[PDB]
Subunit: 339 residues, 4 copies
Amino acid sequence: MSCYMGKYADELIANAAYIGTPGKGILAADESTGTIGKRFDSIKVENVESNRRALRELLFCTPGALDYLSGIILFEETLYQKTASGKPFVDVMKEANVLPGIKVDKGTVELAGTNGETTTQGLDGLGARCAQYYAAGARFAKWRAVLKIGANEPSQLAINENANGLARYAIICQENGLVPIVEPEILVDGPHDINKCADVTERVLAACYKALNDHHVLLEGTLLKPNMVTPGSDAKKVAPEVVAEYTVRALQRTMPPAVPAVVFLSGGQSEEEATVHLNAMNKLQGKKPWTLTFSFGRALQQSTLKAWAGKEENVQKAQEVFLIRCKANSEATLGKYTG
Amino acid sequence: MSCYMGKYADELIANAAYIGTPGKGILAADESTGTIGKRFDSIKVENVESNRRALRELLFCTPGALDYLSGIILFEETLYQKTASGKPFVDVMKEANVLPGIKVDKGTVELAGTNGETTTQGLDGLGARCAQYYAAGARFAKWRAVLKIGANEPSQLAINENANGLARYAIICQENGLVPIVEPEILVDGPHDINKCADVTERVLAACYKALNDHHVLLEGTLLKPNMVTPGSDAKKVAPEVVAEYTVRALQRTMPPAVPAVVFLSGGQSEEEATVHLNAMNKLQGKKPWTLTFSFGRALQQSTLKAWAGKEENVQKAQEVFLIRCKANSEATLGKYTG
Amino acid sequence: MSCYMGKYADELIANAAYIGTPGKGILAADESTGTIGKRFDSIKVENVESNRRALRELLFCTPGALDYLSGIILFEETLYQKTASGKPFVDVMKEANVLPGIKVDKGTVELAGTNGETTTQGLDGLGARCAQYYAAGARFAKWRAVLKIGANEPSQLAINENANGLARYAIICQENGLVPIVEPEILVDGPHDINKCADVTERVLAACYKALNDHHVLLEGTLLKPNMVTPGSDAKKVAPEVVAEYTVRALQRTMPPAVPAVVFLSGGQSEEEATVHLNAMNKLQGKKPWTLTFSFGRALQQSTLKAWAGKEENVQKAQEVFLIRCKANSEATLGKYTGG
Amino acid sequence: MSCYMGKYADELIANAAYIGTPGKGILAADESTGTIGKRFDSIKVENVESNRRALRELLFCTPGALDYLSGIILFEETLYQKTASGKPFVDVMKEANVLPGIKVDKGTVELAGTNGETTTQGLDGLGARCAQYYAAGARFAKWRAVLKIGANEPSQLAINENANGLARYAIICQENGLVPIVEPEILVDGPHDINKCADVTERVLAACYKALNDHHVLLEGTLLKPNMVTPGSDAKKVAPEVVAEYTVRALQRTMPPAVPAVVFLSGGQSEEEATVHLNAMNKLQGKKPWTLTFSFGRALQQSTLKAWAGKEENVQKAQEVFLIRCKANSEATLGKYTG
């Protein structure tokens, strides 16, 4: 009943540690075919593989953006793709000491007997898939569990299924050489206030680290990708300083210091809100024995996508916009962002 | 948080009870292609679809055998197969008021960090597969969890994973019209005695019904397929009467009376050992608020297969052999078998 | 990781089963000083030990009443008390093949951080106290856990604390020779309907039998004292047959057949309501691998206490009233009560 | 389902932090009559109230020793006792900014069905007692759960009973104004090696902090009193540096940074071994977001009792002996002890 000490142990610890290099974060480019569909429909562009490969090439080969990124999450298609000039995307990455990552979950399905709660699909054959993704150069993975806040939600059943789902996924990843990003996402939907989301977050995160210990996960080779602690979509916002204090407090109360880094998700926050919130947290005095950095998708890309508008002429101005967003957030991980 | 109250509730209840009509039990003819290949390799028979179809038609079309059977468990291939004369196998059964059943699990994989313990795969896409199997005429399902007895085994982790795996499976079945057979098999391997197996069985069965309650399963539309309580592989055997008492007691201590029937598994027991034990239990004096019947594979087929030897000439004698085992076990469900 | 196989195993099984003898039930006469002080003030009777002893002798010595009782639950004071002529109360019972029982919990206290939910106190020194009551002639015990039905109640914390409290209590009884009555009472307070109390009852019973298994309790030497499944205090009542079918269904889905008997609590039901409900349950078609009998307190004694009014002259007709209620409930356990 | 938000919250937080002031630790002088009778039996001293009151005044009134102490754990008798000159012991402490603490558990009893495992008594009336101790000047509490390491131990039953006992005790303390010290002691008894104690310690600590979250405890107003991670009593010892690394690793993997301090128990370790280990841990490279300090009984007192031998003439040389142990351990918490 020891935690994972298998052949990948040292590498899992090293690579997890690297993801938490201060000043670096994670680019989430692991959108589905469906999700990038609406990302392309806002820029009035058709969802063809050529246009997806183009956007990925556009991001990954922005001059200098890979100074600010420790890892990039890929959809499986992209893991095997190349630049226009025939260079594998993973080779571009390995040369800039960026780690490639892969989404391995299979989305959500409703839990029988609940009021719209979800469990997450994917454990079937997960070990075989993970060994194949490592052979292709991936070094960390991502799995997304979803929980909702309501009258009786999250239910006890919801919390156990997602916590033990995540722990089961994490230990299979580690056995096949991938650092598992543990993502317990609590949706902002609803009229609750920041205190109710503080409690739900704390209960859920405590449920997850118990499960990880129950399943013998080596915490020093893991990462955590949590929501920030915020009021509901339908409640009045609060100052960014308040969000920071509630969020770092939930983390202090639940997350073992052995876990090297938190890589926040932004939800539906504006590009600036996310960067501001992340800065305010690294400015707080208090115990923070883990890196507080980003894993942004929409929150890094949306302005770049608009400047590009699917045109080749616009590559130059979109890449500068993306390079600025990478510097802003890298400064936010250091407490040095100023608006 | 009530238990399943959906559209299939009444049919699940009637079909579950019907499986327990006295004098009838279940034929497990649900070996996979891999599995049936090593049965065929023992009688030097080719493992091609035409031989698999012939074996199953020989069984299902034994004159009179379906008087003694309430259900038959099929592999997905066989569910869609026909008699030589063009009759779908499900039509053969439905005409003899036999319920067709379908195996829905995808085998076992080792649990990371344990000493050779297993979890069972299959939940990914299970609901769709079940809805498809219902339309093809199946009315109950089977999922097999495996637990072993050792120094520190079954572990607490193994017990929760297999018990919540069964409950997660059971409720998905009920939403799609299949009566779930809950099968927690404790392997006989080892030098332990009958009391160590009595303890482990009681612990495991208690874990499973607690899980089923947590997941809101409708117990009146379910069934149980437990091991009998027996000494280990490597220990001296005990009289069939002792096996009977320990087994009925374990059930008395754990299984709610709302569950209509038990369909015992035979493990590696001889054809006769299985029948004797099943008879000894139905003769035992004591509270038995559930039918004690069979769900046998090897213990109905092994001699029929050896007699057939894959030839069309041997069909008639092999069918006589098969009908003998179906009558004997039907008597054992009534306490009227006499050797 | 065997269930209880200690020296008292055979006796616990014999005595647990005996409680479920058909036609017999349990008189709950285990009111505290405080509690009996609050029915004594309703009949204008001073609450001093000699009046408590007089009431208990009136009950226990009703001619013929112990034909209908397999056990009687006592408060600790009464365990050591005697009839006026000097015969110990336990000896009165032992002569009538009645088993004396003892309340062993120390009441409820609020659960920190919940919304008015409770746990039950009593585990400290329980083993010694039970060993002492056994030598004093007790053969079964009683411990009461309480749960409420509200917006978010019963909570997961409440369910876990009361279920494991009951289980830890149960195994201590068995080690010291007492048959444990497991009583998880779900209060009727509130506007919920009968379906909401079916769900909570099924959830709570499943929790208790899992906890009981975790703690290695010998189920054949235990008993269950559950609420009947009913609509809420503030909701419309339904026909007694409905209460019966819902209640017997909840049990079917959760209570193992090894437990020999159910000894229902009446809560705030009228004396008649309790007997009607208990009769309707034993008439039902269905699987019932356990005795469905009573453990009634207020529901056996309310009219007897009024008839007495604390007077020596009224003892005769008070004992006649109590024998009628013992007869009615004894019929109800057989499906043969016919009104009145 | 918020954690403790009552009137005592700010005070509980301030004092728990105070317990971890650098350079200070806790003197455990909470021996019972029975226990101190076994210390006195060795130095041939009569076990009567005036000799107990004398030993405690000898400790609490050593010139300079309260510079090295943030708190002192008392037996109930001593909470109400006075100096020879009539000054309450609580007043002596309050004047030197030392916090009085009180033991609130009622010892252990065996758990039925285990092989000599224990649960801990004390919850009955705990709230009333804790409120009386507060008005008497106590500000933190102590409860000792015990776990042993064997073939099948610690058991799942043992771990749940002791983890929930501590959490149940923890929240009652906070409601009545006492900082709860959570003490899950894993006994050193046996031939196990240091890795088996690392595994058992990690499992146990994980259960307690989940139990603590279940019961809504305010972690920032608690303390932890864990065993150090060591081989078993009956096994060959390892270097003090090794004990340090295994011990700090066990905590990093389980203890949330919201808890302000660790107050180590010494077990049966010699006075010098305890000080060496504690110094070695504060020298270690690594994340330590919590004070690593002491809560020592025998390991501060044993040589002082021997010098005293229960005589009034010997007070001066014994107090010198006690002051040396208080400075070594005070230096050990700061990495400065040098022999």
